[PDB]
């Protein structure tokens, strides 16, 4: 059981319905792999530095979770299935390292 962070970037052109369905699938899969959600941040659409999937912007989701390590990789797979989901990056959480303090 380790504490991770799930970054998900998906299609900015989605209407509220399709988007809701996507987040629904995310939550669903998360429950399937048994990841407790500690907190969440929805950053919305933002300007990318380079075009992703031909589209200049992207919609961001961030989930701080706790899940069994052994399935983490196996989880990412699922999240990458959706065509609407163009990026998935999972990171082991880390205590912030401050500079100029």
């Amino acid at each position: 059981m380790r504490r991770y962070e799930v970054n998900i970037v998906l299609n900015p052109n989605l209407d509220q319905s399709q988007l809701a369905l996507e987040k629904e699938i995310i939550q669903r899969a998360l429950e399937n792999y048994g990841a407790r959600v500690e907190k969440v941040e929805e950053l919305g659409l933002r300007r990318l530095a380079y075009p992703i999937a031909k589209d200049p912007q992207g919609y961001f989701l961030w989930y701080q979770v706790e899940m069994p390590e052994d399935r983490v990789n196996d989880l990412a797979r699922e999240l990458r299935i959706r065509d609407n989901v163009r990026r998935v990056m999972v990171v082991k959480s880390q205590e912030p390292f401050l500079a100029n303090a």
């Binding site: 970054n7 970037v9 950053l43 933002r46 990318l48 530095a49 380079y50 992703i52 992207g58 961030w62 990026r87 990056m89 990171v91 880390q94 912030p96 390292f97 401050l98 500079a99 100029n100 303090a101």
Partner: protein, 73 residues
């Protein structure tokens, strides 16, 4: 010798390991998309070494450029 400005001293309290904060990291990138050297960033070995991996992370997420085109010249 880079006597113009040191990026660290030009900034306040901030987290180096945080990959989601662009408005800071962007200051650590050159005119081109390249990661600035120790002379310019004014960091230390440890700091710079962490900032490197975080910047790369930000690049993969699409927040930071891999490369840019040089203006003027």
């Amino acid at each position: 010798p880079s006597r113009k400005a040191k990026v660290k001293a030009t900034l306040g309290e901030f987290d180096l390991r945080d990959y989601r904060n662009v408005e800071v990291l962007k200051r650590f990138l050159s005119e081109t998309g390249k990661i600035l050297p120790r002379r310019r960033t004014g960091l230390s070995a440890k700091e710079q070494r962490i900032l490197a991996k975080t910047i790369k992370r930000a690049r993969i997420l699409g927040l930071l450029p891999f490369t840019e085109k040089l203006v003027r010249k």
